[PDB]
Design a protein around this ligand. Sequence first.
Ligand code: DGI
Ligand code: DGI
Ligand code: DGI
Ligand code: DGI
Ligand code: DGI
Ligand code: DGI
Ligand code: MG
Ligand code: MG
Ligand code: MG
Ligand code: MG
Ligand code: MG
Ligand code: MG
Lengths: 133, 133, 133, 133, 133, 133
Amino acid sequence: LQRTLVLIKPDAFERSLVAEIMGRIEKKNFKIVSMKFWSKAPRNLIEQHYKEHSEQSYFNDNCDFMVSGPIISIVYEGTDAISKIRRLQGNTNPLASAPGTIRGDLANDIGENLIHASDSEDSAVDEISIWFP
Amino acid sequence: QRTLVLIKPDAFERSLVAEIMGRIEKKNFKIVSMKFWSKAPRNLIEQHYKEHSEQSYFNDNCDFMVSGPIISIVYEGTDAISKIRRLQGNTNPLASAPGTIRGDLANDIGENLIHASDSEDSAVDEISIWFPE
Amino acid sequence: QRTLVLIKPDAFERSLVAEIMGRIEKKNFKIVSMKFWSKAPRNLIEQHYKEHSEQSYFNDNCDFMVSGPIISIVYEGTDAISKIRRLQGNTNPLASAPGTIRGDLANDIGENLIHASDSEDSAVDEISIWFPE
Amino acid sequence: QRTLVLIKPDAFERSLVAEIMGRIEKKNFKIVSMKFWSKAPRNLIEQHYKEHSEQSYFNDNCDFMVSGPIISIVYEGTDAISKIRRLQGNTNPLASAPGTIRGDLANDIGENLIHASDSEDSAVDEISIWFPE
Amino acid sequence: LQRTLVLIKPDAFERSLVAEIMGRIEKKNFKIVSMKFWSKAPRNLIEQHYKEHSEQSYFNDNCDFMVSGPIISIVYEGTDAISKIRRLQGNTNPLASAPGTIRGDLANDIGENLIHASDSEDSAVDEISIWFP
Amino acid sequence: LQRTLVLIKPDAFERSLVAEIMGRIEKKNFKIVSMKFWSKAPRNLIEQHYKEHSEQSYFNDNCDFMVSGPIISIVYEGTDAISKIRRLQGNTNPLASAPGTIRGDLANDIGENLIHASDSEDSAVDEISIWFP
Ligand SMILES: Nc1nc2c(ncn2[C@H]2C[C@H](O)[C@@H](COP(=O)(O)OP(=O)(O)O)O2)c(=O)[nH]1
Ligand SMILES: Nc1nc2c(ncn2[C@H]2C[C@H](O)[C@@H](COP(=O)(O)OP(=O)(O)O)O2)c(=O)[nH]1
Ligand SMILES: Nc1nc2c(ncn2[C@H]2C[C@H](O)[C@@H](COP(=O)(O)OP(=O)(O)O)O2)c(=O)[nH]1
Ligand SMILES: Nc1nc2c(ncn2[C@H]2C[C@H](O)[C@@H](COP(=O)(O)OP(=O)(O)O)O2)c(=O)[nH]1
Ligand SMILES: Nc1nc2c(ncn2[C@H]2C[C@H](O)[C@@H](COP(=O)(O)OP(=O)(O)O)O2)c(=O)[nH]1
Ligand SMILES: Nc1nc2c(ncn2[C@H]2C[C@H](O)[C@@H](COP(=O)(O)OP(=O)(O)O)O2)c(=O)[nH]1
Ligand SMILES: [Mg+2]
Ligand SMILES: [Mg+2]
Ligand SMILES: [Mg+2]
Ligand SMILES: [Mg+2]
Ligand SMILES: [Mg+2]
Ligand SMILES: [Mg+2]
């Protein structure tokens, strides 16, 4: 049994895909245990969330995108939730994400890619602490 | 207008949260605030339904409303109150119309998936209950 | 209550069996009995529709009903008879409402996808026809 | 009967083209002609809506109708005109019924996703406008 | 042209996913040629169905699960139906089943995994003989 | 940014899957820039479209199928549209096409396979020139 942190990104709001994305996770039988709506996430939380990427060329653009509209932060719980939701999410690169995955079916950009999900136990604990202190 | 919607515990039990939210999303209403409650305080539920305090079902309904999670949402849109009420459908499963949320999904007078404010005055009161900030 | 539903041969031809069953399932009705007929005996069809024996369409309708498979289902739920009738929608394609099974999917008075018992008395008779056990 | 349907520019903006066409397709109407317009000529739009020429919204509506692509479709079926009108739903978002295209998807009196001919006489006129061949 | 044996498992009934599962197979153009509904399958048929696993640690628990609610047994027919429906079904292990498959999208447990499908021509004949003697 | 040529094949019309197929591409955020409806495509355009296969045993049967009902020719535009839509389409062979893809979910034959999509930049230019001279 694990908890993982998911962000529904501003592009999901713009494209009216919030329920579609949440629905794919819900139909897999994962349970919401925490959830917050952000009309606009604080820049500092975004920069902390993506701190690994702070020295990458796309960092500033990614952070700008992430504060360009609302986000939902959700903690999902289930057996092996972290890897399972990562599999559902699909590859970052739209040339690689498989049909059937959230990104494979719905995303068409490496940056505007609809959903974040924790990639490991350690990062899940870290990310949950950021969004749900 | 702004209206107050509750996703009720039966929606969680039946894994219909995204389905309900999706019907409102597809109608182009915007989420302005949202909170997740693992279990709403009974006092909050009693206040929300204070006008039913003398009804025979009052306690049973309060028990149901604290039996599982709730999501409270403020939606915004032109004439959002009446429009979301029409999408919601009648309380009575003998009357709620196919095509409405309750008409398609609810099969009980009490366990009826969704609350929506019924007037501007009740919207103000309910938003103040669920989002006192 | 228990009611008798037929999935008609046009549902098989048009690959709408799951769609129709899904609309009833999502309303939370429980299957109590079910039988698949590769081709129903004409005599069974004539008995089912015996009250239409003098109508001009009687033979054509019987021909249609044996033209492909049927699934007969007994569904159970509070006020299941009237509720499933409302989901079914009117026989006449000029009247069946969008949101109903026939309103959304049927475009003919005869080839109309689904039968549902219209009263408690007819439910008893029809269940005895299709499930004499 | 044959009727003239327009998929309006808001359907393109909101990525609802397939959703709308799918609702008509599932009702078993057959496409007899179809044209895609990257931008319809304003004169065509003015002719289509000539009966509204004195209305206060006439110019705003024409502006909207040339603001993005349109698909014009001739559909054929028994009583196709009235049936597709019923699927379409009322112009007014305070009236369009859940289960209809506008009832489920449209939230504005002007930006209302779909046109459908309202009579046999108007169907002839509109088909001659969009498909003069 | 082949026939294969599918079981819709009790978890599909509990989670109201029966039509969803049948619909995925129906949309692939497979035809139902036999079908039976079991309110509760006999223990002996279940133990025979899973006889290969009789000495495995999970055998008793699996059999208990399989008689814990209704099942539907279906014979589907199509060209290479056996391998095709196996592909649609997805891996037993929820750490392996691919998004897009029935289990990949809907199942979250190695035991409660929604659907059985024959794994070969020989086992299909055997399983059909069990459920449809 | 690329343009690719898609054909919706006559089997999609027969099976009422036109909107389903177009919807999968639309939800991926690809934009229609040209579209034509053919009640019956001219034999010569079909033979030119498939000229690579002119000496294969299935050529005549494939061409016969392709003129057996309507087709829609669509030009879609998006970043890397050619490879992305090919991925969505899925393998020609129904023993290989992955669940989650259009063919993996919906097609059950190597010939009647619902959709064509250009396989390269060069063939896209060629095919667009054929259908949209
Ligand atoms: N423009 C651009 N943006 C990128 C690139 N790589 C990553 N990003 C953005 C989008 C990602 O969602 C986010 C975090 O990257 P990640 O942890 O490698 O990917 P992911 O766990 O979201 O699939 O940063 C990239 O290569 N280019
Ligand atoms: N068991 C039972 N519960 C009832 C009955 N009438 C109302 N309720 C419950 C369910 C309703 O969602 C809630 C509030 O009643 P309402 O304001 O008349 O209905 P609504 O605005 O949720 O459609 O109280 C009732 O008659 N019986
Ligand atoms: N062709 C034709 N068929 C008809 C007509 N009226 C009824 N039928 C057929 C289709 C109906 O499903 C069946 C039983 O008629 P019903 O009990 O009045 O309708 P329903 O309970 O299936 O809605 O007989 C009719 O007027 N014309
Ligand atoms: N802004 C605005 N637009 C309107 C109003 N009434 C009609 N329109 C626009 C939207 C309609 O689709 C179009 C044609 O009006 P109509 O023939 O009465 O409606 P309809 O046949 O599209 O349902 O003109 C109106 O009252 N206000
Ligand atoms: N708890 C548990 N149950 C298992 C395990 N392996 C198989 N089972 C159960 C669930 C399977 O649906 C059933 C038959 O196993 P199978 O033939 O290897 O899998 P499958 O053809 O259903 O994908 O037995 C297992 O490793 N653990
Ligand atoms: N009957 C039959 N038809 C075939 C076979 N290979 C190809 N075809 C038909 C169906 C294909 O859609 C069409 C073009 O073949 P293709 O370019 O290799 O496949 P595709 O780009 O449509 O996946 O010709 C084949 O091996 N057998
Ligand atoms: Mg990451
Ligand atoms: Mg109320
Ligand atoms: Mg009747
Ligand atoms: Mg009009
Ligand atoms: Mg097996
Ligand atoms: Mg090719």
